[PDB]
Amino acid sequence: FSELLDLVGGLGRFQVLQTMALMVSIMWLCTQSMLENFSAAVPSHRCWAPLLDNSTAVSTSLSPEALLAISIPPGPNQRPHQCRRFRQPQWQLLDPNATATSWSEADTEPCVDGWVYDRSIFTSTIVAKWNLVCDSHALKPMAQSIYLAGILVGAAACGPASDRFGRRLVLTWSYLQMAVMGTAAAFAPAFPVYCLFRFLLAFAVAGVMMNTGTLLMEWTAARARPLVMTLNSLGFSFGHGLTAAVAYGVRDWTLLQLVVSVPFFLCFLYSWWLPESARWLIIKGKPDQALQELRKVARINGHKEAKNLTIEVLMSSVKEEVASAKEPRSVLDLFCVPGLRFRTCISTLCWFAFGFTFFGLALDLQALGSNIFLLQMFIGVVDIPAKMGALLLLSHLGRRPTLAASLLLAGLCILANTLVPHEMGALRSALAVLGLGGVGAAFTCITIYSSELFPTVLRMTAVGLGQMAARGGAILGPLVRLLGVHGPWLPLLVYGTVPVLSGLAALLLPET
Numbered sequence: 001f002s003e004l005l006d007l008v009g010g011l012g013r014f015q016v017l018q019t020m021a022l023m024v025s026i027m028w029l030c031t032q033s034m035l036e037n038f039s040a041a042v043p044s045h046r047c048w049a050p051l052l053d054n055s056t057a058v059s060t061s062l063s064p065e066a067l068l069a070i071s072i073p074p075g076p077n078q079r080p081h082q083c084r085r086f087r088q089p090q091w092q093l094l095d096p097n098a099t100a101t102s103w104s105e106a107d108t109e110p111c112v113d114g115w116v117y118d119r120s121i122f123t124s125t126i127v128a129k130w131n132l133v134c135d136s137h138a139l140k141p142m143a144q145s146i147y148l149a150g151i152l153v154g155a156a157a158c159g160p161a162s163d164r165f166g167r168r169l170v171l172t173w174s175y176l177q178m179a180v181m182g183t184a185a186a187f188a189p190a191f192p193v194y195c196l197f198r199f200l201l202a203f204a205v206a207g208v209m210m211n212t213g214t215l216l217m218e219w220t221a222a223r224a225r226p227l228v229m230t231l232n233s234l235g236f237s238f239g240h241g242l243t244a245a246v247a248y249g250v251r252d253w254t255l256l257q258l259v260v261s262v263p264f265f266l267c268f269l270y271s272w273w274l275p276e277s278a279r280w281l282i283i284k285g286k287p288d289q290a291l292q293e294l295r296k297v298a299r300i301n302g303h304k305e306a307k308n309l310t311i312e313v314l315m316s317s318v319k320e321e322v323a324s325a326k327e328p329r330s331v332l333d334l335f336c337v338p339g340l341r342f343r344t345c346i347s348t349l350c351w352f353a354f355g356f357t358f359f360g361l362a363l364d365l366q367a368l369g370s371n372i373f374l375l376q377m378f379i380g381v382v383d384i385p386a387k388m389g390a391l392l393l394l395s396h397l398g399r400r401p402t403l404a405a406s407l408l409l410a411g412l413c414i415l416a417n418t419l420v421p422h423e424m425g426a427l428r429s430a431l432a433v434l435g436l437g438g439v440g441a442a443f444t445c446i447t448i449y450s451s452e453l454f455p456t457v458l459r460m461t462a463v464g465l466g467q468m469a470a471r472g473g474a475i476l477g478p479l480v481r482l483l484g485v486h487g488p489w490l491p492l493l494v495y496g497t498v499p500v501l502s503g504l505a506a507l508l509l510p511e512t
């Protein structure tokens with residue numbers, strides 16, 4: 001096919017504009033995923049109580065700090081209890097001499113009158129709106145898990161739709177669906193509907209993710225394909241900083257979710273403008289339109305060959321592939337052929353390690369550091385140079401030497417969080433971010449690597465399987481964090497255990 005791109009211009013204006021346009025959409029799409037750190041942030045909270053919150057209460061010289069000890073028992077974390085209150089005011093507890101036995105456990109009651117939340121950092125969050133705390137606390141990681149399962153099912157549905165209707169035609173409606181479903185999620189009346197809308201949003205997120213990359217590859221000459229895919233990957237790195245900026249600017253979740261969703265109505269329009277994938281139209285029985293798309297791109301690049309491209313030349317120049325790639329085949333065919341079976345096994349373990357380790361740690365930054373906005377931004381700041389170095393190593397050594405080394409180093413950095421002492425907070429945050437950056441370098445490496453390992457028709461299906469495995473690990477992520485009832489030691493050890501072994505296994509994969 002590349003002989004035709006050589007007539008159309010393999011790296012001209014059109015590829016520049018296409019890369020820019022898709023990079024922007026990928027940035028906003030990344031904000032859509034990372035938003036959970038800010039839309040669903042858990043403000044500190046306590047039970048409503050008369051002496052603290054009754055506006056009709058008789059005034060006294062007692063400070064709020066004293067009334068709080070009079071009204072809320074001490075929690076096991078040595079802070080005011082977040083799920084209990086005193087049945088009757090403990091005036092006796094005002095003195096410092098009071099024993100722990102002064103108030104009986106039977107004097108405590110749950111938040112009968114509801115919770116009160118800290119408004120200082122965020123004006124509103126879903127946790128504050130639907131009381132996803134105490135007995136309901138599990139619902140937040142359930143929301144994240146449902147979002148990731150939505151991505152998984154969307155990856156399952158994208159491939160067939162992409163091949164049946166075209167790359168750009170699926171991408172366009174994925175943009176529209178993201179816009180509409182995010183706008184609706186911003187206004188959901190109750191938690192079940194919010195989860196429903198987030199799920200239907202992730203369903204389209206998956207299609208955008210896959211189609212943008214596939215359509216970048218299918219229009220770019222091979223000599224610069226890795227560079228373009230690296231830029232498409234850096235879209236997410238910049239999306240991290242964009243998320244930090246918007247979350248700093250918009251402290252209300254109902255407004256933040258709307259703001260990060262509206263841009264996709266604009267992305268819709270430019271998705272309409274773009275051309276459908278020429279190779280797809282050529283192989284899928286529509287050269288008559290592939291010629292029109294080709295000469296559209298030629299006009300944009302300014303080539304004279306618009307006078308040369310003709311249907312007979314088009315049919316002649318792709319004879320080999322048109323004569324052989326006539327068969328659609330099921331997903332399980334990736335596992336039926338002996339060679340593709342092993343390629344898929346190793347690539348799937350690599351994708352699983354990426355998705356597991358990254359999405360386990362990237363969505364709970366409130367535990368990793370004292371400033372969630374800055375810590376969110378630092379993920380992009382560290383991911384940029386990691387992915388550029390990944391590109392350089394992938395070019396000057398190869399795909400195989402880069403993948404294994406990146407995963408091993410990221411695994412080591414992840415594990416180090418369990419060996420540095422708890423009190424050295426800054427170093428722990430630094431190492432966590434470094435591990436995330438190494439996993440990002442492995443993400444870029446494998447994205448390029450596994451797109452080469454599979455044939456023309458099934459490339460999209462192979463990448464979809466990669467997405468599904470990575471999001472299986474991602475779904476296990478929040479549940480691995482629900483395992484945190486035994487303390488943070490277990491989740492971090494779990495996250496660190498996988499990537500090192502996945503890297504050691506990666507070395508068996510053939511170079512491409």
Ligand SMILES: O=c1[nH]c(=O)c2[nH]c(=O)[nH]c2[nH]1
Nearest residue numbers: 030033236237240383440443
């Ligand atoms: O390197 C990545 N960083 C991300 O923040 C992100 N988000 C996502 O869905 N895929 C990726 N990949």
